[PDB]
Amino acid sequence: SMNPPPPETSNPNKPKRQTNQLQYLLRVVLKTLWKHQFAWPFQQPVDAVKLNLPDYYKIIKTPMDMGTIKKRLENNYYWNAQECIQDFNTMFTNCYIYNKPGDDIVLMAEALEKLFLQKINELPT
Numbered sequence: 802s803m804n805p806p807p808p809e810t811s812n813p814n815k816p817k818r819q820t821n822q823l824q825y826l827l828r829v830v831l832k833t834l835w836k837h838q839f840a841w842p843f844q845q846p847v848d849a850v851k852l853n854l855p856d857y858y859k860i861i862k863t864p865m866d867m868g869t870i871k872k873r874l875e876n877n878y879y880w881n882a883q884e885c886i887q888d889f890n891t892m893f894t895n896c897y898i899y900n901k902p903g904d905d906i907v908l909m910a911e912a913l914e915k916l917f918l919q920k921i922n923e924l925p926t
């Protein structure tokens with residue numbers, strides 16, 4: 802298939818954790834970013850069949866999206882906030898990698914990344 806399986810949202814071999822920072826990342830950061838006018842392309846894994854992007858997964862080897870991140874947070878999949886933040890950063894970077902400077906989708910990622918950074922600048926203790 803053109804589409805690989807989506808990234809795991811559970812892994813019984815991996816330990817779970819809940820922290821105040823992870824709770825914040827779900828309740829405030831993700832759930833607020835989700836409502837942004839530019840969030841829609843990033844709310845689910847890229848579907849290469851739907852979007853007619855047969856090269857997407859030929860180029861992007863560590864796919865990530867906010868749907869996956871949300872499920873991971875809901876599952877307590879992450880050990881800590883930094884692990885979650887790394888997934889957001891992978892999502893943004895993938896967008897810059899797959900596309901070109903100035904592309905509409907890149908302008909969307911750039912705006913979301915700024916909002917994301919604003920929100921994670923300060924996390925709860």
Ligand SMILES: O=c1[nH]c(-c2cccc(S(=O)(=O)NC3CCCC3)c2)cs1
Nearest residue numbers: 842843847852853854895896899900906
């Ligand atoms: O690099 C990435 N592109 C996307 C994406 C997902 C759904 C739609 C779009 S888009 O802005 O509507 N571009 C269309 C995608 C195929 C041709 C145009 C981008 C998520 S991550």
